[PDB]
Amino acid sequence: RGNLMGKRVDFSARTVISGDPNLELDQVGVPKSIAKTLTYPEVVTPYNIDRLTQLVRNGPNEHPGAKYVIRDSGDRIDLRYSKRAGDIQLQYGWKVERHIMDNDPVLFNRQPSLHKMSMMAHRVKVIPYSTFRLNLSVTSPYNADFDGDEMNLHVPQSEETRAELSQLCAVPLQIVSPQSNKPCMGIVQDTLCGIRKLTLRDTFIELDQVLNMLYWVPDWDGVIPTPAIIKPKPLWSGKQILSVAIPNGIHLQRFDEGTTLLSPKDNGMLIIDGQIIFGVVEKKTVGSSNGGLIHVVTREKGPQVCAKLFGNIQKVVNFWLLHNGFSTGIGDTIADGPTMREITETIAEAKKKVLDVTKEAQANLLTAKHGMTLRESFEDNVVRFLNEARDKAGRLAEVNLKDLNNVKQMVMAGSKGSFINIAQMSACVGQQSVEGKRIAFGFVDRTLPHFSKDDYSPESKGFVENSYLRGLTPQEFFFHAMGGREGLIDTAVKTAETGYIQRRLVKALEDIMVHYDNTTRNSLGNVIQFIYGEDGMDAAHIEKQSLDTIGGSDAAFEK
Amino acid sequence: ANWPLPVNIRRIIQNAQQTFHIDHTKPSDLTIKDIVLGVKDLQENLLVLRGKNEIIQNAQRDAVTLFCCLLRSRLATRRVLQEYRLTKQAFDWVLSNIEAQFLRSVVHPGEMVGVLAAQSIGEPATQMTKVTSGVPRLKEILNVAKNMKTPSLTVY
Amino acid sequence: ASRHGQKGTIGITYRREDMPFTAEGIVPDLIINPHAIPSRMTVAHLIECLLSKVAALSGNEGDASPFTDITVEGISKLLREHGYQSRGFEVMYNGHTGKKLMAQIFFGPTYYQRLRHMVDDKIHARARGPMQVLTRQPVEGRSRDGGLRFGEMERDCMIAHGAASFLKERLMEASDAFRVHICGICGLMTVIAKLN
Amino acid sequence: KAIPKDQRATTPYMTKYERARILGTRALQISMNAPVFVDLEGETDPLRIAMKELAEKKIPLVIRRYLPDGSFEDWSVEELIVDL
Amino acid sequence: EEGPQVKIREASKDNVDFILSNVDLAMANSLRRVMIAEIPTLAIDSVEVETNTTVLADEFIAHRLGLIPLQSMDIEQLEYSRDCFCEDHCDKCSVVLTLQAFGESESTTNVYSKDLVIVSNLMGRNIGHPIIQDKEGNGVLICKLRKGQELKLTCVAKKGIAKEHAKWGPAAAIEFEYDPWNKLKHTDYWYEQDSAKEWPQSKNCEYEDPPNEGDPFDYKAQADTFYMNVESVGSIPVDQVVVRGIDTLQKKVASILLALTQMDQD
Amino acid sequence: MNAPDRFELFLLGEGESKLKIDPDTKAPNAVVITFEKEDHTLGNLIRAELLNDRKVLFAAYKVEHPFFARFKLRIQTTEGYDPKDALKNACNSIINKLGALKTNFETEWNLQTL
Amino acid sequence: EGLVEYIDAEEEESILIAMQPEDLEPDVDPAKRIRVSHHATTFTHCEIHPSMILGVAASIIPFPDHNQSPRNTYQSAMGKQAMGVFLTNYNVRMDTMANILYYPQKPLGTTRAMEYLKFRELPAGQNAIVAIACYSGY
Amino acid sequence: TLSHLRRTNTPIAKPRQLHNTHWGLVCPAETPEGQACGLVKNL
Amino acid sequence: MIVPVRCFSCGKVVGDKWESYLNLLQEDELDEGTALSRLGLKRYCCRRMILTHVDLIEKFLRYNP
Amino acid sequence: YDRKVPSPTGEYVKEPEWVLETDGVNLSEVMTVPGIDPTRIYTNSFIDIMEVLGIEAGRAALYKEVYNVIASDGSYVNYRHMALLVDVMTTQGGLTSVTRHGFNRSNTGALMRCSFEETVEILFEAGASAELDDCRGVSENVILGQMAPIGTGAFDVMID
Amino acid sequence: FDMGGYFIINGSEKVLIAQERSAGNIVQVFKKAAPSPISHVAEIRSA
Amino acid sequence: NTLFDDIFQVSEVDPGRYNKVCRIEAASTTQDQCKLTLDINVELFPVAAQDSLTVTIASSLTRSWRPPQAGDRSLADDYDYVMYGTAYKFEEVSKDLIAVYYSFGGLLMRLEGNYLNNLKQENAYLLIRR
RNA sequence: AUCGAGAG
DNA sequence: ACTCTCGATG
Ligand SMILES: Nc1ncnc2c1ncn2[C@@H]1O[C@H](COP(=O)(O)CP(=O)(O)OP(=O)(O)O)[C@@H](O)[C@H]1O
């Protein structure tokens, strides 16, 4: 397992990764030093003898250059110590180990390599500084942020293997994944939020900025689109200039809730012939969804056009967002006075209800549900009440938020954050729980020495009325600390056991493939599936379609 | 009704009523024989297996049964003529395109899909946070638990 | 990293001209993305920014002690008394064009700390280096100019891809590739191959 | 034993692995200054040249597809269909 | 004159508060950028340390030495070391000034910027002299020596741009604000209740007319009136900061024009 | 370590010309000019001054990557109007306005105290 | 003088501790946090100060009661990786490897517990003028 | 240094969970993650 | 260590204002805010630069080597 | 439980029924009870399903449970993957576990099974029984450092 | 500022990490599992 | 040339969570079977309640949009508020009721009428005055 | 070789 | 029953 199944290799590198809005999807930012370090053997041919001669003339230390020169006899010439490093007559058939240059096929990898999208072939772009620069939209398949993450890079040493990397392991070829028959890459973070802020109907763009955004697209036809507004002032909408990024022949139709072809809420999405007709573009569209824009563009125009699409969208949206700006402060966590009052009174009536149920249970009037203890029924009721309280106050705080509220904006765009985040930050973080149950009696008949015995009150068993804005009391803080602690514990345990399960699964289904008869077998020839997937289709080229014959009345079917 | 199938027919159709720019107020230069026999002969080309014996052919029809159901559902005479109002050229183009995309959608022999499956199940199990569910339940399933933690009986 | 579990590396460095600026001409020493706020729920970071801003302006020392009755409202009032938006927001101008920004920016002092993890101590690259003696494979360690382990999971990935030749290259030419002689009878490495 | 040129059940289309293997092999040949059977027309990259050579079916290779029983079907690159 | 207009509201040795009238936004912005970065200044670029028994490290001292504000009045009749035909540096490109400090008294012996002594030949040019805006006349506190601690070094100061290093920055903070009433609506204000009561009122509001609610949105309006406040460090006077900024912008435009003139060659 | 030299932001490298005029293949009578060792300071100003000319159909600048000090400027003018002349007119206009601004500031400065 | 006692957990089992000394006394601000009224009387001990439940690394965290607990844990972990002055005599020690911050700064937002941890004397970070904003996208 | 001089190591039902009796004796937040979480504590 | 020569954010010289600051705290018995205000530190970045700084060199000079 | 049921008019309409959930499992005697539908009864234990209703029903229940686990988190995996797993677990005749007790006892290659869990002992018993390794297993060619019959190497390239 | 509390071995500063153990001479009763023949166990670790 | 011309009476104005665009609802004062819904940039051309706006649909007044130079050019409008969009749906309510859907860069429009020369074409200039 | 701390 | 990075001691 340590020297045969997996072993240390040459022509490899590892560095801290960083995001780069101005790199293509299938590219990788490679530091110059690594470029001078890693090398590729290129045989001298009439097509490249001049270039290779120039590279040898540059030698090491200067990129692009070369490290070694292999002759016919097999002798190795070191271009940093040899006396004849200046004068070399490159004979045909000689090998030249040159520095890694631009548009070279390399293998980008990040541990743990859970699925095949953890190792993908990228195009080299030699850049300054000491970081592996990668496109934002390639974050998802690698599962990688930039808070200190490090990635590895491997280099092919022959034409056939780099052919394998470029024709099989290429990033555009991995856009639509056979895992969930959907694209595993999409628009995220700034590009997402921004594309939500751009496609608003209040978003109009004047001449100059429009010209800049237009020129920012490398696949621009150079044709200025006729503005949505002519008089009194020529204006372009965000959708209009964003349409330039979307290729022709692209048709996308999706109805949300009240999407009635006129859409008073500007919801849903209609895009005709690479031109967005109506709807706000966000996660449901430009994200990594099933019938998303990326999936359609990939299956229609191709993987290359889709990667270039990533590029264009990123460039335009990031440009507009750069000159529009977006932030987030504590003010985006402050609901109105009366709202906080209704929240407090909600928690109040909740605790009142819990109190009443408690008193009822103590009066031996509580009738146990069929199949559980009186005490278990009581616990269930109280827990449900406190949960309903948190959800209620949270929904109040959510309703109170404005459309200009930055947090709510990020939630709308689908960039980051959800409802419970708003609920806990602004309203009430809710009930803490350990091992499924609320804070148990660590001490005799009590959770903390600050409480009396047999105190089943919400504040005693770990309910936190306060929000992160208001601040937690010592008790609430300690209980929350217990909850978070259990969180970290079961997190480590989870990644451990999953770490094992993955390996077990891999080793179990290791030698299974589709033979030249669509028969899924193994190394023994044992038939697992007579026809792969019981249909013989590759999971990549499969989309969720409706069978409109299985539904509707017989009269409608006939009609 | 919504189920994962190869070849998005909707996109092909909406591309047909866009590539040829057909108007919704013009008689179609088609025939009942064109549509019916055309679609019926289209199913003959949607090949997954290519044997010459009865077994392989049965496996073939069984393999393309669902997609053929979808095909007939979308390419019905009433639907083709009234809902899409396609022409002869547009209909033929649709047929050829469907056949092409279907032939593309076939899995390529040599596809190490065992490992692909193991990873396609293992990876999403990593992003996982009243019976026992989640990672412990998965561990029970894979280990084939002699004594599962929450044995349940659902009686109708 | 800040003082609230908000870590992150540097993406790029911008000079003061390219940096956004408030009407006072004050330029940020550091720019962080808002997306690192709602999902992680670090309100105390924002409150730290506000308190540090007010304490900066007033010249006092902001009390950020855990269980006190210091509230965001009081800090906001104190900040408004100094002539600023009570919620820490400031109207900033884009450094490139000089044009204003639509949304106002949460802007202010925050205590940041430099962690021990720097790139030049992490960066590593090897193209045919020193080998071990027992297994004849690349040595272990960056400090020993070693190679990186093409782990089992990596092998699994290359299998899933279908790149067999690459997998062979990583497991031979890139690592240890040896030529041995085998007897045609017993099939063992008993062969005494006297070459030349 | 073998399998006759008729009654071949394997896919008439070239698989992506077959394409990658053929382009890789051909590019490996070109990389060692081997005769090119197509017009270069400016191309100097052996992979690209092998691709253009594949597009014109000027590749004298043949695929031996193995069946799990031991049988094998031969498919010339000129005959195979490249729809990818 | 005939074009853009200036209205000096406040003026001093360190600051200039004025109003740029009849100008495009991009020109004001570019002027700001040039004033920040692209203005030549004399600052320490080379430090030769002989003896250093102080607490601070060598390059630790060299750093703050580089940040010392030096006289850059006649910096325009000084030359870049990279342009001069001399070996390393000379009197036509660089200014050499020494520093010799030693702990004398039992008390802590402070080492300021006034202790820097010019050695090279200035030959008339007002240059090299460390700016001392200090009240006592000491200047920047460079280091501190104990009882027997010694610091002996030499500094070679060269002409440099703040674009290359912030030590060559002639200006500090440049205040910049246009349209104090948001009449152009370049900014969508954030609020919880009232937008006007929450957001403070700018001083420059005293110099413009408030909008009328009866009036609609002026969509055909641009940015003409800009309010600026330029602050100098001491190396270059404020008026000369903004003037040399203007002349620098003009010159680097003229270089592009000259390039266009040159590209007509066969 | 891998950080580039600072002077590479304003000092032209070996063989690198200041301007690179390229015939735009997209729309007719258009051009893309590569400015080396320059940033937004020059680009934004020139672009903004190229829009004042009413015989200019298109004018836009962009910095393809912040790592490198350079920017591309695309200009499209009406037929019978070479874009280089538009660039020249824009530049001269800028120079004149700047000179007038300098004179005005000087005259305004000579009338101050303290 | 019998004013303070040393209590372990086992003896802590049989006492009633008051959280704040103001819980011994017999229209509000909506901004503050909701604190439950003392429904107990028979106190025997009172907490010195609740902030003493934290350790040395956690005491550096500003407003830790306004954070999600795992974030407090994370910061407690990363605080030991921050640079600064670990000792005044760092120049006369021959450590294997040491890192000292160029210009250390005592945080603008401190803790009352920092006074005893000598953090304001030997800080580990600088007050950076931070800006929360989507700019260039880098 | 201060943190390292006040650390707690534990060899080997739920010793990792922050127990109620850890109040005032052991820091609830300061603890390693991933492996020795809950086992290694600080006073 | 010692008082930073210039403010990080803007670039204003603040190294010559350290001793004076101290005087304004002990001689005139003012608070930190007014002392910082009198030294011409209006922007809170420079104001920070001086207020936030800790002079460690004084403890460093306590050694004899 | 709520339930979609074909209306006599045609469309699918929600028809809610009463379903008895249960803590405890004994399928062999509950389905034979008069009163309930013995064709829709189901247990979360695919073991009892495999023992009572056969190996195919055990397959369906196994996939149902795995899919239930995957979808419980809110995720989604294509059918063919989980189907492949369940099939490989159910093709031996019974329920083969994904451990050293299950698939590692198969009649595959020695090196392959040695490259997982019990390593040395496998080589021992394979050396005692004198087994033959076909060398068409992935990990086997991985050990031998040869181009394994994987995707690209799943065929041969000659010249004509 | 050095607080001490550490040793100096071969010039290397060493810290004795506090070791957590179960207190001895304490009587504790524990319920055993279901397959176990014994139901309860009252044990004590003598020191 | 021209494709449609009528005078509508604004019955409703609705700022649906916006501040620059309001959804307008009007009806024809000639045909008792004709109505109109239209997203309007109020910030440019303010539309209060109970207004009589003159509405026109044109096909002209493709090539890149040249700035309005000088002009000294045939604007062919002299209206107050002019837009340019694209029809995307031809809904048929009845045989005597035919509706059309235009999209002006997102600003949608539903025109219900009876008697039309509005084909599914990119040409869709919307001219409103007074 | 082992052990300890730490990084995703 | 995943990759890294340092330190220590034999
Ligand atoms: N034992 C282990 N095996 C594999 N991966 C591990 C690991 N321990 C840590 N990691 C990696 O370390 C990462 C930890 O990053 P985190 O910051 O915890 C994710 P997050 O912040 O909750 O999500 P977010 O970025 O969506 O907000 C995990 O994603 C995991 O991939």
Ligand SMILES: [Mg+2]
């Ligand atoms: Mg992340």
Ligand SMILES: [Mg+2]
């Ligand atoms: Mg990470």
Ligand SMILES: [Zn+2]
């Ligand atoms: Zn033999």
Ligand SMILES: [Zn+2]
């Ligand atoms: Zn000189």
Ligand SMILES: [Zn+2]
């Ligand atoms: Zn400052």
